[PDB]
Design a protein around this ligand. Structure first.
Ligand SMILES: [Mg+2]
Ligand SMILES: [Mg+2]
Ligand SMILES: [Mg+2]
Ligand SMILES: [Mg+2]
Ligand SMILES: [Mg+2]
Ligand SMILES: [Mg+2]
Ligand SMILES: [Mg+2]
Ligand SMILES: [Mg+2]
Ligand SMILES: [Mg+2]
Ligand SMILES: [Mg+2]
Ligand SMILES: [Mg+2]
Ligand SMILES: [Mg+2]
Ligand SMILES: [Mg+2]
Lengths: 58, 106, 117, 55, 145, 78, 143, 141
RNA sequence: ACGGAGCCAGCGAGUACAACCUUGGCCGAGAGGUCUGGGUAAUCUUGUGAAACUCCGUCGUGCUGGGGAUAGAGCAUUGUAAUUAUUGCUCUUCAACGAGGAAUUCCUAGUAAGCGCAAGUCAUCAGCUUGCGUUGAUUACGUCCCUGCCCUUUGUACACACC
């Protein structure tokens, strides 16, 4: 899309806030601890630091 | 057969500095490893983002005002390089966070 | 002088095309009609035309209640008997020849004027 | 709730045309850069967003 | 250069449209005294009447005085556009006019009684004699009589 | 408010022959004459005061030394 | 010796060049002159009854000569100062665009300015020579 | 080639950069003669370096100055600094350092900011007022 | 004050899944309109040619060309909707106001003040606020006299504490 790069970073920050608030909302039962985003050249990896890995994986 | 020169350009953006500097230095070092000519990693003016809010959430009391800011940097780099070498260089060693853009500038 | 609005007497204004008055009718009316206005004044216009037709030619037309205070008087409305929505009562305005140009809201006082002392 | 009546009023523009994307509060919104967050959920989540105290 | 200025001809009192105009003031800024005649309109009518703007209103002869009072009674004929007119487009007849000292006052009063007769919100507010342009009246004026 | 000003006309804006002669006679013997210095002697209103001042600078009756706007310095010539 | 417009004071040169255009019967004068205040912010029309348009045209000529090229909106932003908005704080108000458009059209008619490739009106060879001539005349008038 | 050096002066934001060569005595700020600095007030101020040196002490030195930023008079003070710094730089790069010492002594004996940059600078404005160190007003009632 | 003539800044911000910054050119006196172009931004707006200020002229002490509130008449743009005048422009009307009582507010160097600019509020609006730059000073460089604050000593019948 055609978005200002400054606005692109702002939107990325809002995206990160959404993802973190989401992962806080659900994964509390599984002990949510943190979320990381790596926008790779090809993919966009997301890492979950969580306590109950067996439960979060399912 | 894309051996001809394309006048490619690499744009960068990062909310931080250390990883941006590392990425730019790595790109330059890889270009020297393949021995390509370049214009240096010219820096761009600090695009600082400041927005002010009433620090109180309701609106009473002594008028208190707070300022929230980021500081982003671009540091574009142009390469007089062939096609596949610069593609391999720009598609490797991208640490997270630092947004990278590639343009042929044909 | 009996009455002249913008050079046209009541004799011609009483039977006057609306758009030929839109060439008249200072800037705000011209802008309104250039943008177009809406279907709701068209319905109001038809209702008042029917009411004026059905009035028995010697009594004033029946009161037509109306919420549209954003309305300007068209030349083809003079003599109509419309109750503009003050909020509680459709307070009455009978359409005098000088109504044209002025809004409905210019005659429905939304506030009762205050009295001190 | 004849569809032609209920909710017919347009909200293209104005105070009520935008929601907080957090709570939907119309009062005190940050429309700069399309944050679309109000002042105070924004001061809550800004350190997470990337804004920081510098000066 | 400097002029001895016509010994015994420096008039002081003039009667233009039954207005007691003084002469020691500049011509445009003396005619601005007449009601309905502002600085801009007097300046334009002076420019059209080819008389010096810096020339004083005390020592003109009667011919020029009457020529201008003719000019500022039927302005549109003299390459004065519809604007620069005291009552633009004149909502009585559609013929744009420029009301003058007593005509302006009389027609303003007549418009006031028209607004009464129509019983308009603006007209009723004029009947009371209060703020009419809709401003806040918490502290506006606070003293009128 | 009160009639405490009691300010008369105090000025004749346009010169007569008499005041013409007084200006051209008292033009010397004054080491300094300005616009308002000329106004002080009641002989001119003040808008025509500078007109008379520049009109005394026609045959060098009064030499100018500074020619700034709103303030020119004129000294009698000898 | 060699003289340029930048080598003479702005005010004396501008008045002299306005007078020079006054002498020549060129530089057609638009109809609506003597009527317009050159800006809404101004309170009263120019004190200069005749020749003020020549002054503005001369100012346009020198002002284009200084840089590469300008436009009518650019002069509109430059022309006109502050408007006494009744009680309201004095702001910047753009000058009347019609007067500047007519000034530039008349200057094109004189061949002192033409349409620039970048978009706008740039100085002309004949125009810059004429400005150099009037600058030399004013400088020699001074000394 | 021709001996030439490049300097600058500042006032609060205003930057005046000067290119000085060995020529025939040109003082052209913004491609204009020095006698024609607009303010008309601080004109002698741009004369200040020149007139402390004496024009006779530099006639085969020419200077061209490009300037921006700041206000009018701040620009003029930047002009002062630019010309003084350019002249002293040319002396100390090409003629001699005894000359630089004597020019610095002559300069600094008057308006010390001739060669040194005005180091004190505006400070940020804050909330709770309409000035950097100003409060709105208080009522108590 | 008003006319002309000069012509100096900085922080910002700016259209995309929608319609912003607007250059330049034709119009209109204006507001404003139109044709086209760039700019997702050190590119274009923009070097935001900003005011205050600088020079030359008119006014010359008179509620005067100070002052522009209050009133009408028109023309424009935003808005589905401008009437209780949205706002801008044209013309006219011209108020009070003579540097303002007791009291009281802010301030020690790019500071007070004057002057604007940009951003936030935004469809449209500011007199506001937040940031920025510009012209840039007078007066201390100190003391508890007033209002309080801190630490210690002392006294109290006070502790929901001299209200
Ligand atoms: Mg209340
Ligand atoms: Mg300007
Ligand atoms: Mg101006
Ligand atoms: Mg001025
Ligand atoms: Mg003022
Ligand atoms: Mg201040
Ligand atoms: Mg005025
Ligand atoms: Mg700048
Ligand atoms: Mg008055
Ligand atoms: Mg002021
Ligand atoms: Mg507010
Ligand atoms: Mg007890
Ligand atoms: Mg007690």
């Amino acid at each position: 899309a055609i978005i200002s790069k400054k606005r692109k970073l702002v939107a990325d920050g809002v995206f990160y806030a959404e993802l973190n608030e989401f992962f806080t909302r659900e994964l509390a039962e599984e002990g949510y601890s943190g979320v990381e985003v790596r926008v790779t050249p090809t993919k966009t990896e997301i890492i979950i630091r969580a306590t109950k890995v067996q439960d979060v994986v399912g | 057969q894309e051996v001809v020169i394309h006048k490619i350009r690499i744009n960068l953006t990062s909310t931080k500095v250390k990883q941006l500097e590392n990425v730019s230095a790595n790109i330059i070092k890889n270009a020297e490893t393949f021995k390509l000519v370049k214009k240096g990693p010219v820096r761009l003016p600090t695009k600082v983002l400041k927005i002010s809010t009433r620090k109180t959430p309701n609106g009473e009391g002594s008028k208190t005002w707070d300022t929230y800011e980021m500081r982003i940097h671009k540091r574009y780099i142009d390469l007089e390089a062939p096609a596949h070498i610069v593609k391999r260089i720009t598609q490797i060693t991208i640490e997270p966070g630092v947004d990278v853009e590639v343009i042929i500038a044909a | 002088k009996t009455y002249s609005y913008k050079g046209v007497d009541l004799e011609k204004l009483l039977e006057m095309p609306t758009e030929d008055f839109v060439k008249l009718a200072p800037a705000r009316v011209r802008r309104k009609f250039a943008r177009g206005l809406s279907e709701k004044p068209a319905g109001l216009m038809k209702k008042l035309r029917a009411a004026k037709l059905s009035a028995p030619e010697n009594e004033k037309p029946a009161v037509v209640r109306t919420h549209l205070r954003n309305m300007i008087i068209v030349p083809e409305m003079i003599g109509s008997v419309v109750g503009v929505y003050n909020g509680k009562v459709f307070n009455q305005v009978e359409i005098r020849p000088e109504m044209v140009g002025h809004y409905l809201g210019e005659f429905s006082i939304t506030y009762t004027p205050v009295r001190h002392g | 709730a004849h569809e032609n009546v209920w909710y017919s009023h347009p909200r293209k523009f104005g105070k009520g045309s935008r929601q907080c994307r957090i709570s939907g509060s119309h009062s005190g919104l940050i429309r700069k850069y399309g944050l679309n967050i109000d002042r105070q959920s924004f001061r809550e989540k800004a350190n997470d967003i990337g804004f920081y105290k510098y000066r | 250069s400097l002029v001895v200025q016509e010994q015994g001809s420096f008039q002081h009192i003039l009667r233009l449209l039954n207005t007691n105009v003084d002469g020691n003031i500049n011509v445009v800024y003396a005619l601005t005294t007449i009601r309905g005649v502002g600085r801009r309109y007097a300046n334009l009518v002076c420019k059209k009447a080819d008389v010096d703007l810096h020339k004083r209103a005390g020592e003109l002869t009667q011919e020029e005085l009457e020529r201008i009072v003719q000019i500022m009674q039927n302005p549109t004929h003299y390459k004065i556009p519809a604007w620069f007119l005291n009552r633009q487009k004149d909502v009585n007849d559609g013929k744009d006019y420029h009301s003058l000292a007593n005509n302006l006052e009389s027609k303003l009063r007549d418009d006031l009684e028209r607004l009464k007769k129509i019983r308009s919100h603006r007209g009723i507010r004029h009947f009371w004699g209060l703020r009419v342009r809709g401003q806040h009246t918490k502290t506006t004026g606070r003293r009128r009589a | 408010s009160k009639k405490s000003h009691k300010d008369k006309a105090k000025h004749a804006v346009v010169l007569d022959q008499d005041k013409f002669d007084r200006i051209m006679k008292e033009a010397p013997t004054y080491r300094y004459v300005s616009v308002s210095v000329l106004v002080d002697r009641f002989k001119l209103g003040g808008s025509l005061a500078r007109v008379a001042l520049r009109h005394l600078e026609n045959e060098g009756i009064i030499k100018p030394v500074s020619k700034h706007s709103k303030q020119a310095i004129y000294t009698r010539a000898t | 010796p060699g003289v340029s417009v930048r080598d003479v004071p702005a005010q004396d040169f501008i008045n002299n060049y306005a007078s020079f255009l006054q002498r020549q019967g060129k530089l057609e004068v638009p109809g609506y002159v003597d009527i317009v205040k050159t800006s809404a912010g101004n309170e009263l029309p120019p004190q200069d009854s005749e020749g003020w348009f020549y002054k503005r045209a001369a100012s346009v000529a020198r002002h284009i000569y200084l840089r590469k090229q300008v436009g009518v909106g650019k002069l509109n932003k430059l022309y006109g100062g502050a408007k006494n908005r009744g009680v309201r704080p004095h702001k910047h108000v753009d000058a009347s665009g019609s007067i500047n458009r007519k000034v530039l059209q008349s200057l094109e008619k004189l061949g002192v300015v033409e349409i620039s490739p970048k978009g706008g009106r740039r100085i002309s060879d004949n125009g810059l020579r004429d400005l150099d001539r009037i600058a030399a005349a004013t400088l020699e008038d001074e000394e | 080639t021709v001996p030439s050096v490049q300097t600058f002066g500042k006032k609060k934001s205003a930057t005046a950069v000067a290119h000085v060569k060995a020529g025939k005595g040109l003082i052209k700020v913004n491609g204009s003669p020095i006698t024609l600095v607009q303010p008309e007030i601080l004109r002698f101020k741009v004369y200040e370096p020149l007139l402390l040196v004496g024009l006779d002490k530099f006639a085969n030195i020419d200077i061209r100055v490009k300037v921006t930023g700041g206000g009018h008079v701040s620009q003029v003070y930047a002009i002062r600094q630019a010309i003084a710094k350019g002249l002293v730089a040319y002396h100390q790069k090409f003629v001699d350092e005894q000359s630089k010492n004597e020019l610095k002594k002559a300069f600094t004996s008057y308006d010390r900011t001739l060669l040194i940059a005005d180091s004190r600078r505006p400070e940020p404005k804050k909330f709770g007022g309409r000035g950097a160190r100003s409060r709105f007003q208080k009522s108590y009632r």
